[PDB]
């Protein structure tokens, strides 16, 4: 009766944006990013990739409610580096790591199977 | 308290007697007549008075409430025992004590014996002042309780001062 | 830097080992292969007639759980993205089932091999139900007595396991790390002795046991994961792994594109 | 006759919770019925918030008529009752 | 029909068909027309 | 289909309802990849002393691993130690504990989790068969109050205890609106002499008249519950005259 | 002996000699139909057994095999009933393994 | 730079009911009547009976939001092995020179007993304790 | 059925469910219920655009509207109006919009035993068909999630919306007047979680600390310094929990006379919102009085208390999510040595019972006074068996390890108790029916499997086995008999309790506190000349001690008396800046003498009249210790700075403060006498706390601190008075009837009914006779 | 009713092993041995196959409705 449609878990409505960014004025160089139609799969990966960066001073994420498919990330870097540049660097690094992993898995499957 | 003033535990011997006979036991020599107590507050009213009856009733209610360790604020039990002993005699919490009050017929009929109370009110030509809460509720008005315990006027002086 | 070591491999399952990767990366890969790898499954059932004892929704739900070959499902288009009305040839696969019992004695068993792929987005290799062997009967669908007939037209579309579990390409993904509890990530419940009361992991011989005189390493991190992926036959295990990696890469690329366009 | 002079009022000078709730509700209803507002409106749109802002600044034009049990009453302005 | 009152009620009940066990339990049911905690206890003779 | 709010119970009196549903990738998983179909709070165990629940779970796990049905007949020689030995002989922990992993992050759980098959049954108490709401609908013919029954689009009852709670809260206006505007409000006319509800009123041509007291001017109108009107009419029918006066004689 | 796992039988040492005239076929037969479904009822609390006996009438399942040809006011049928992994010996006479 | 510094010989090590926290009781070698009891982490800093620990109590590590330290900069903590930070919650000025200082490091308690001439500078709101061996 | 109670419109009812991600005063409302229910909002210039958008959305889409009411009262149905996309609203119209977020609604569970069973919540529209509730509001509602149905009512006017928001709001109902203690607390998993969180050996890595800090809604964005810096940063759970606690909160509690070392990590010390030491459990974050919740409420406000509830719940829930907790069968299994000890104790008890039987059968048992020989023998046997069960349970509890899950639950206080562990692991115990052992239902025997005249424990309802070991058929039958008796007793008790509660409510229905301070009924008859004899609300009193009553005379003289003529007995020179011009003064000495005489008079009045038994801890308003410590923290009274507060200033300030605690206002002599009688006890407490020697030496206040304390005391006493118009009669009736549901002379519900009915015949009449001292 | 297509817990296909399980049970193989020979490792699939009751035959015993 009141059950929401399943495809709303991953289909982004046209009137809402996939990504929202709002500056945080409590501490310098800190931003809040609202990810829509996402879950822990991308959030935890991005968080642990950003945590290892020397220029990132704070990174965290939270899912406010399991019934809603979105999460909120807080990211703060040092003075030299803007948080958005760190986020793009993390995304590129994970993409390169996944490409290397796929290449090596394909090589292993070709060598023995 | 001792000679130094510090409170210390002292053990004494008292009697616990089955059955109730207040005046005769109080008159017995060798008995502290200023401290004899009974668990039947009716006998206390018959012998001691009404204030002693209120004290004994509060003591009994407190014992019943706090035997199992529960705690209830003193003001509620004080209000209950004041209501029970407000007319100079014990007012039982039942139709034999509540319905005998001089309150309105509408609020009395709502508890028990509705038709009998209504017939008695019709025969006795009683008048209801509509000051209680029950007859205000059944008539669909603002009861004189809480936010309805006053009236709100208009401040002409402050509006003029603008 | 990441390394992959394959211990066992077969078309139904792969037991492999990852190293020099973060724990979140392995967990995200497992989650993506579990829920975010697109496959092809029946999502629309048209019942022309059904005289069997099974209910219509019962048979429809049974048909929706039948795995189908989704080798070329990546080239297929989503129903929402398709601009055609209802469904067309390049966004769905049409299957036909017609079963009837011949004779007044015995019971006719209707399996999943009776489905016929009448039409689909040719010449893509999708739609055909998965068969274990060339002579495998398949998944038992229903049973029919005399004068009982089944006539079903099914529509198969492309979807992911998030919408419904019937599009899941894999059954169960075994995943573990640190068989000897060197990192002390867990505390072992015990009555007398913790070492004796707890069975050894199947990968305990792969890692050296901790010495009794060893001191705790506070700077150690999980760096060796053992994971076994089992599929339902819709996709090969290597295909599932590669497509999960590709899906994760596409999600990250979409996030990067959104970040770039946000300026 | 039944009124009590201002210099002879014995009731508490504080605003009770019931009086506060009644004044807030009445002021919110009046504001919702297009009544003049004695305070500035910056961003708030809820009439209850406007009434609360008026109460904080002690500008509500209402008078509480507290009724004694005998029948006499005391009139207290909303601008002279202490609000916690 | 004339003497609706002063007669035992609930002697015959609609059979329960929620499950087999419930049906058996309903078919093996006894009741006492007493409508005092003395008869409600589990006596030793009930073994 | 089961959803949030559906009632499920075990064979030991451990009834409950679904609070939330998690997908396959969100549920905790063991090293073998098995995810539970149901998660229950441990806090329900020690209060009710349902040791039989845990014993049944252990026996079911042993029987599922070995491939038969366990015997749970009371007053037998079967003990927990024998079942624990059987479970230990099958390569599992003797007490049924298993090392589980968090679904969100993949990290090991610090505390091991009791994990095993258990018989559960679905009860005939579904949330979709109990949800009810009403703004305005049919009313009773006699009292002009909302009808009773979820199917008949009925109204919830504001009993005497709710009235007592509202009196304690001090919210007189809410109680008045709940018992008048959300219920059988009605308008009646009374005469300023007899006080009785015998005033004949014609609002189309604006004529108010009282036959008994020959009155046409000193007539008032009141807003009262329809049940109050019915009570007053019944009292009049029983040769009782309740007169409603809007002024205090003193 | 001194077994720490099995339960302890009563001593029954108040009589030097015992002369039994009858023997119980099985103590578990003292239970009813609904109480025979509970696995290990002797390890539970009696209010829990009463609660389970009461709520056993609310579970749904295959009450009869001819539900397709019957016209009942209400009927609830589970798609995939399963026989319990832990069972009592009385269930064989209650047809629970055949209509779970 | 350092408010207090001394060398303590460990007398008693009590694991208690904790698998990670040990309470150590010792006295200063160079002067008696100075007793140190302190809760420490077993895995982070495993100590045994009859050890010798150089203990330094300071106010700042310089030579508000916490951030991970870069490898480039240096602090006093580079010269020690175990570093903890905590709040002083009691400065008991008892009879004669017997003075006790109570410091809580996130729930790990430490009590230092000594004289005024040695513990007069420890009367602060926050403290850093550094142990080297 | 139609006037006192009736069926009402704009109401909903559905099954409830739990939700950790909701605030204390928030309720989750399904989409269908929010769409069906509606609220009429007027059309003004402040909400014209929103109302037009809601109308354009229609009744089938949320947010939307159902009806549009014109100025004259005509109604337009948006369901049948298919051209609603080009309709304009006029000022003064009413739009029946859907239930939106942050809408106050009454929320109720039946039966409604007290005022906390019906509270105002804020609507949050959520999917699925169950009401969502915070876990901390289940206890006041007395609800669980096994199929409970609860009701919701929607106000339809601005005045009633304001009444619900300002009177019946959930945060305002945290503290109840029944026992001046909170009724909402941290319960269930969260409680257990914090017990596993604030342990001394709990450490958190940096990334988890960042996640938990971000999970705090009220976090200030500043990362606290870790407890350990080298060789790896580490945060303890105490710091993470203290993050949720607001600053400025001070709390102190001792457990078993523990010292500041706290070797067992018991007690509790919270300074400025940071936990110095102490494991947080039910004793701290529970519903008990004087705990963290009560202190935070009385210090900050209901809004901050609800924020604390939410913050603690979120942090502990995340930590338990990423840590894990479980229970198993192995938690109910003891080792061989403990089982041997339990069996030995049971065998020894059985031998003692056999010895008692032998003594009784030979006329050797001592006869108890006023009891039959059989009754004395039964009492002896029952006492021996109960002692055996208690000893076995104590041994089983002592055997339990720290990692045991049942022991963890018991220590946390979330669930379980000693008796549960004893019955699960050691021994079920003796089964009792109607206060005695199992009677001989058959011919001189309980069961046909025993011989005649058998008095052994196993033949009369003793279950020597545990639940883990199983039960013999005889023990099973006896346990079933006991359980049936308990169920019957509960069933018969509930109806009597309900009838008693209804009678009490009807008796005290029309009692209100008026504006003159009196307590009168509907007739105007005065019941009490002052409510509670002090004119104070039930929620504004806390247990405080009066320091004048206890102690010896020498201790009283040392603590309070000040002698300026003698150097030794005078004020210490190092704490006051005026130590030069204070020796030998006559006016200051006279003032101190007058203060000491007032203190002595207060001591005499308290000891000889009010409290003759020497009790000193009583409920009083205005916590003075909290005020003193708050002033000390605010004004930074450390560093042993010499106070610039003269003795006459202290004396005159205390004297002026004692005369400004106004309860009744007026110049009538009776009014002054009533004011003095009402404020006597509070004046005694204030004079005990604010003594010249105590201020100058123990507390070390200055002029600013003293003035702040006086002002705070006056303001808090003014705020602690009872508000006129309060329906005290119904509150008292509910507060008396509520414990009755939970619960050799007659006691319990029969005794309460006997008292209330005023029975002329007493079931167990008795007299207590006191003799002379000699 | 009839054997489920997929395991409820993990999702392994078990709907095609009913005939093989019955054939193995017919030739005297034990239930555990038959389950092992069906390559069912996790006990979720083991209880899916072992505890299934075949009620389809009872419904088929009735005469067709049309
Ligand atoms: Mg319930
Ligand atoms: Zn198409
Ligand atoms: Zn007339
Ligand atoms: Zn499975």
């Amino acid at each position: 009766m009141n059950a929401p449609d399943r495809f709303e878990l991953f289909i982004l409505p046209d009137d809402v944006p996939k990504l929202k960014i709002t500056p945080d004025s409590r501490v310098p160089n800190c931003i809040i990013i609202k990810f829509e139609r996402e879950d822990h799969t991308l959030a935890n990966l991005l968080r642990e990739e950003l945590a290892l960066y020397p220029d990132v001073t704070f990174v965290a994420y939270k899912v406010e409610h399991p019934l809603f498919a979105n999460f909120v990330m807080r990211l703060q870097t040092e003075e030299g580096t803007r948080p958005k540049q760190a986020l793009e660097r993390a995304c590129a690094s994970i993409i390169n790591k996944l490409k290397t992993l796929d290449h090596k898995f394909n090589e292993e499957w070709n060598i023995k199977n | 308290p001792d000679e130094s003033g510090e409170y210390k535990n002292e053990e004494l011997w008292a009697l616990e007697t089955d059955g109730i006979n207040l005046a005769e036991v109080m008159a017995v020599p060798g008995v502290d007549s200023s401290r004899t107590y009974s668990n039947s507050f009716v006998e206390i009213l018959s012998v001691l008075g009404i204030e002693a009856t209120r004290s004994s009733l509060y003591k009994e209610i407190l014992n019943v409430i706090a035997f199992d360790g529960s705690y209830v604020n003193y003001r509620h039990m004080a209000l209950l025992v004041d209501v029970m002993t407000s007319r100079g005699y014990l007012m039982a919490i039942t139709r034999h004590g509540i319905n005998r009050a001089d309150t309105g017929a509408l609020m009395r009929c709502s508890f028990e014996e509705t038709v009998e109370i209504l017939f008695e009110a019709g025969a006795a030509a009683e008048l209801d002042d509509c000051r209680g809460v029950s007859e205000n509720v059944m008539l669909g008005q603002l009861a004189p309780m809480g936010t309805g315990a006053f009236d709100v006027m208009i401040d002409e002086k402050l509006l003029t001062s603008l | 830097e990441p390394k992959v070591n394959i211990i066992n491999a077969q078309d139904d399952e792969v037991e492999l080992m990852l190293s020099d990767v973060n724990l979140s990366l392995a967990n995200s890969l497992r989650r993506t292969m579990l829920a975010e790898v697109p496959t092809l499954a029946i999502d629309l059932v048209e019942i022309k007639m059904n005289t069997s004892v099974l209910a219509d929704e019962f048979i429809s739900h049974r048909l929706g759980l039948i795995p189908l070959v989704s080798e070329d499902v990546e080239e297929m288009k989503y129903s929402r993205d398709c601009t055609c009305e209802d469904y067309c040839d390049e966004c769905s696969v049409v299957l036909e089932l017609s079963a009837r019992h011949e004779g007044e004695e015995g019971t006719t068993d209707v399996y999943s091999s009776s489905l016929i792929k009448v039409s689909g987005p040719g010449n893509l290799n999708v739609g055909e139900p998965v068969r274990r062997d060339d002579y495998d009967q398949g998944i038992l669908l229903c049973k029919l007595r005399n004068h009982q007939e089944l006539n079903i037209r099914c529509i198969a579309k492309k979807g992911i396991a998030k919408e419904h579990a019937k599009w899941s390409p894999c059954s169960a993904i075994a995943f573990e790390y640190d068989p000897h509890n060197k990192l002390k990530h867990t505390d072992f419940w015990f009555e007398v002795d913790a070492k004796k009361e707890w069975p050894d992991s199947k990968y305990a011989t792969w890692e050296e046991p901790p010495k009794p005189g060893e001191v705790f390493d506070y700077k150690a991190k999980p760096n060796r994961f053992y994971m076994t992926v089992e599929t339902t036959g819709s996709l090969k295990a290597n295909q599932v792994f590669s497509r999960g990696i590709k899906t994760l890469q596409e999600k990250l690329a979409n996030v990067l594109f959104e970040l770039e366009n946000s300026r | 006759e039944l009124a009590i002079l201002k210099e002879e009022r014995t009731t508490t000078p504080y605003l009770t919770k019931y009086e506060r709730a009644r004044i807030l509700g009445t002021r919110a209803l009046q504001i919702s019925m297009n009544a003049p507002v004695l305070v500035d409106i910056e961003g708030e749109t809820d009439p209850l918030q406007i009434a609360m802002k008026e109460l904080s600044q002690r500008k509500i034009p209402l008078v509480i008529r507290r009724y004694l049990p005998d029948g006499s009453y005391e009139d207290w302005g909303c601008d002279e009752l202490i609000v916690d | 029909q004339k003497k609706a009152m002063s007669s035992r009620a609930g002697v015959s009940q609609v059979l329960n068909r929620y499950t087999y066990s419930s049906t058996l339990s309903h078919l093996r049911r006894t009741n006492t027309p007493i409508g005092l905690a003395k008869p409600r206890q589990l006596h030793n003779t009930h073994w | 289909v089961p959803q949030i709010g559906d009632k499920f119970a075990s064979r030991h009196g451990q009834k409950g309802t679904i609070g939330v549903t998690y997908r396959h990738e969100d549920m905790p998983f063991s090293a073998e990849g098995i995810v539970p179909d149901l998660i229950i709070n441990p806090h329900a165990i020690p209060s009710r002393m349902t040791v039989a629940h845990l014993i049944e779970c252990l026996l079911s796990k042993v029987g599922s691993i070995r491939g038969y049905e366990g015997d749970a007949t009371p007053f037998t020689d079967l003990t927990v130690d024998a079942v624990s030995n059987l479970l230990r002989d099958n390569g599992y922990q003797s007490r049924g504990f298993e090392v589980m992993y968090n679904g969100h992050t993949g990290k090991k759980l610090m505390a091991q989790v009791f994990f095993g098959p258990t018989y559960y049954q679905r009860l005939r108490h579904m949330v979709d068969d109990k949800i009810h709401a009403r703004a305005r609908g049919p009313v009773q013919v006699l009292t002009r109050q909302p009808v009773e029954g979820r199917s008949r689009d009925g109204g919830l009852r504001f009993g005497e205890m709710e009235r007592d709670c509202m009196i304690a809260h001090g919210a007189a206006g809410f109680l008045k609106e709940r018992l008048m505007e959300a219920s059988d409000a009605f308008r009646v006319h009374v005469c300023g002499i007899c006080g009785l509800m015998s005033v004949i009123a014609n609002l189309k041509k604006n004529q108010f008249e009282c036959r008994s007291c020959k009155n046409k001017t000193n007539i008032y109108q009141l807003h009262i519950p329809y049940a109050a009107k019915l009570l007053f009419q019944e009292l009049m029918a029983m040769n009782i005259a309740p007169r409603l006066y809007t002024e205090r004689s003193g | 002996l001194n077994d720490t796992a099995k339960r302890i039988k009563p001593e029954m040492s108040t009589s030097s000699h015992h002369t039994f005239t009858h023997c119980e076929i099985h103590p578990s037969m003292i239970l009813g139909v609904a109480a025979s479904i509970i696995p290990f009822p002797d390890h539970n609390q009696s209010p829990r057994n009463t609660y389970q006996s009461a709520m056993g009438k609310q579970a749904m399942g295959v009450f009869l095999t001819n539900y397709n040809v019957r016209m009942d006011t209400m009927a609830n049928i589970l798609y995939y009933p399963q026989k319990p992994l832990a069972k009592t010996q009385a269930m064989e006479y209650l047809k629970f393994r055949e209509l779970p | 730079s350092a408010l207090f510094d001394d060398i303590f010989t460990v007398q008693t090590v009590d694991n208690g009911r904790y698998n990670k926290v040990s309470r150590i009781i010792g006295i200063s070698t160079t002067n008696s009547a100075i007793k140190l009891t302190l809760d420490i982490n077993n895995e982070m800093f495993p100590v045994s009976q009859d050890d010798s620990l150089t203990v330094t109590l300071a106010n700042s590590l310089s030579l508000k939001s916490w951030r991970p330290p870069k490898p480039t900069d240096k602090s006093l903590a580079d010269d020690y092995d175990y570093v903890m930070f905590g709040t002083v919650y009691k400065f008991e000025e008892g009879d004669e020179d017997k003075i006790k200082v109570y410091v809580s490091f996130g729930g790990l308690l430490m009590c230092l007993e000594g004289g005024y001439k040695s513990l007069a500078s420890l009367k602060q709101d926050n403290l850093y304790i550094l142990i080297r061996r | 059925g139609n006037l006192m109670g009736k069926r009402v419109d704009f109401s909903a009812r559905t099954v409830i469910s739990g939700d950790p991600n909701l605030e204390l005063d928030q309720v989750g409302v399904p989409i269908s219920i929010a769409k069906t229910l509606s609220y009429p909002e007027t059309v003004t210039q402040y909400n014209i655009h929103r109302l037009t958008e809601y109308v354009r959305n229609g009744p089938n889409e949320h947010p939307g509207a159902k009806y549009v009411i014109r100025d004259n009262g005509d109604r337009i149905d948006l369901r049948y109006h298919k051209r609603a996309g080009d309709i304009v609203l006029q000022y003064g119209w009413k739009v029946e919009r859907h239930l939106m977020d942050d809408d106050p609604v009454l929320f109720n569970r039946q039966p409604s035993l007290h005022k906390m069973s019906m509270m105002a919540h804020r609507v949050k529209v959520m999917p699925y068909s169950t009401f969502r509730l915070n876990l901390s509001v289940t206890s006041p509602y007395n609800a669980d999630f096994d199929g409970d149905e609860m009701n919701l009512h929607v106000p339809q006017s601005e005045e009633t919306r304001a009444e619900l928001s300002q009177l019946c709001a959930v945060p305002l109902q945290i503290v109840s007047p029944q026992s001046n203690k909170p009724v909402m607390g941290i319960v269930q998993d969260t409680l257990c979680g914090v017990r596993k969180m604030t342990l001394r050996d709990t450490f958190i890595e940096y990334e988890q600390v960042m996640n938990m800090l971000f999970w705090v809604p009220s976090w200030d964005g500043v990362v606290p310094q870790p407890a350990i810096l080298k060789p790896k940063p580490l945060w303890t759970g105490k710091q993470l929990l203290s993050i949720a606690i607001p600053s400025g909160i001070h709390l102190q509690r001792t457990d078993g006379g523990n010292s500041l070392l706290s070797p067992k990590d018991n007690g509790m010390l919270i300074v400025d919102g940071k936990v110095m030491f102490g494991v947080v459990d039910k004793k701290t974050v529970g519903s008990g009085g004087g705990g963290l919740i009560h202190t935070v409420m009385r210090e900050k406000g209901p809004k901050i208390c609800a924020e604390l509830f939410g913050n603690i719940q979120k942090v502990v829930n995340y930590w338990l999510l990423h840590n894990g907790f479980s229970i198993g069968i192995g938690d109910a299994i003891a080792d061989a040595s403990t089982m041997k000890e339990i069996t030995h104790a049971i065998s020894s008890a059985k031998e003692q019972v056999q010895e008692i039987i032998y003594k009784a059968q030979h006329n050797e048992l001592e006869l108890k006074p006023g009891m039959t020989l059989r009754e004395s023998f039964e009492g002896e046997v029952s006492r021996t068996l109960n002692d055996a069960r208690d000893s076995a349970g104590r041994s089983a509890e002592m055997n339990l390890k720290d990692l045991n899950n049942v022991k963890q639950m018991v220590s946390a206080g979330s669930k379980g108790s000693f008796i549960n562990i004893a019955q699960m692991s050691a021994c079920v115990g003796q089964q009792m029916v109607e206060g005695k052992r199992i009677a001989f239902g058959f011919a001189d025997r309980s069961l046909p499997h025993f011989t005649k005249d058998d008095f052994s424990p196993e033949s009369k309802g003793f279950v020597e086995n545990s639940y883990l070991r199983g039960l013999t058929p005889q023990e099973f039958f006896f346990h079933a008999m006991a359980g049936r008796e308990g169920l019957i007793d509960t069933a018969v008790k509930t109806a009597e309790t309900g009838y008693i509660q209804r009678r009490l409510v009807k008796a005290l229905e029309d009692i209100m506190v008026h504006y003159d301070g009196t307590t009168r009924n509907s007739l105007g008859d005065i019941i009490q000349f002052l409510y509670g004899e002090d004119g104070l609300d039930g929620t504004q009193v806390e247990r405080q001690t009066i320091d004048t009553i206890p102690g010896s005379d020498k201790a009283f003289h040392k603590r309070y008396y000040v002698d300026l003529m003698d150097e030794k007995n005078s004020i210490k020179p190092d704490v006051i800046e005026y130590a030069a011009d204070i020796l030998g003064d006559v006016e200051l000495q006279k003032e101190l003498n007058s203060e000491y005489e007032q203190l002595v008079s207060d001591r005499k009045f308290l000891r000889e009249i009010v409290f003759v038994n020497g009790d000193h801890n009583w409920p009083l308003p205005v916590n003075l210790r909290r005020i003193i410590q708050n002033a000390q923290q605010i004004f930074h009274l450390d560093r042993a700075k010499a106070s610039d507060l003269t003795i006459p200033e202290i004396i005159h300030g205390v004297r002026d403060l004692c005369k400004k605690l106004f309860v009744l206002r007026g110049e009538n002599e009776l009014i002054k006498e009533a004011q003095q009688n009402a404020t006597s006890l509070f004046q005694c407490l204030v004079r005990a706390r604010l003594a010249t020697r105590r201020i100058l030496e123990e507390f070390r206040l200055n002029r600013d601190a003293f003035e702040w304390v006086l002002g705070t005391i006056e303001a808090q006493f003014q705020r602690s008075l009872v508000h006129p118009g309060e329906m005290v009669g119904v509150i008292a009736a509910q507060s008396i009837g509520e414990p009755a549901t939970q619960m050799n002379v007659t006691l319990g519900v029969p005794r309460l009914k006997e008292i209330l009915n005023v029975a002329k015949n007493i079931k167990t009449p008795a007299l207590t006779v006191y003799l002379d001292r000699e | 009713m009839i054997i489920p297509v997929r395991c409820f817990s993990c999702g392994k296909v078990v709907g095609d092993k009913w005939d093989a399980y019955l054939r193995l049970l017919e030739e005297g193989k034990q239930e555990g041995d038959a389950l092992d020979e069906l390559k069912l490792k996790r006990y979720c699939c083991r209880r899916m196959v072992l505890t299934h009751v075949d009620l389809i035959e009872k419904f088929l015993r009735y005469n067709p409705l049309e």
Side-chain angles (χ1 to χ4, degrees), chain B:
Chain B
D2 47 14
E3 305 96 355
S4 43
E6 182 66 26
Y7 277 90
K8 75 187 181 324
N9 277 311
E10 210 164 59
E11 294 179 353
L12 300 175
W13 291 109
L15 314 174
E16 196 272 331
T17 67
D18 267 318
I20 45 171
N21 206 347
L22 197 43
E24 305 311 309
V25 166
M26 293 177 70
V28 161
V31 161
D32 209 346
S33 57
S34 80
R35 303 194 61 212
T36 316
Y37 177 69
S38 175
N39 64 7
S40 167
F41 54 90
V42 184
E43 208 182 28
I44 307 286
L45 182 79
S46 195
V47 171
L48 282 177
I50 182 66
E51 293 289 314
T53 306
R54 187 251 195 193
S55 303
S56 69
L57 194 48
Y58 166 71
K59 176 176 167 66
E60 290 299 315
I61 292 176
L62 166 66
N63 263 6
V64 172
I65 288 299
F67 183 79
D68 65 335
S70 300
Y71 170 70
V72 172
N73 207 355
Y74 165 78
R75 54 199 67 252
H76 318 310
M77 287 166 302
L79 182 54
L80 171 64
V81 304
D82 275 335
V83 166
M84 270 183 92
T85 69
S86 180
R87 316 178 197 168
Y89 50 88
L90 276 298
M91 193 214 78
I93 310 295
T94 180
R95 69 188 183 277
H96 313 283
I98 292 157
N99 280 3
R100 294 331 181 251
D102 213 358
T103 52
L106 283 187
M107 65 179 288
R108 274 191 283 115
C109 84
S110 75
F111 172 49
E112 285 182 355
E113 316 158 81
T114 292
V115 298
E116 299 93 324
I117 291 299
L118 285 177
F119 278 162
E120 212 196 350
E126 325 194 327
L127 173 80
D128 204 304
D129 63 358
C130 284
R131 292 196 281 151
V133 295
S134 286
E135 65 268 17
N136 276 283
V137 175
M138 65 183 73
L139 280 185
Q141 305 168 335
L142 190 78
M145 51 145 278
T147 54
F150 54 90
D151 291 331
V152 174
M153 304 293 103
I154 182 68
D155 208 9
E156 161 69 17
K157 290 300 150 282
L158 166 78
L159 282 181
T160 300
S161 176
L162 287 194

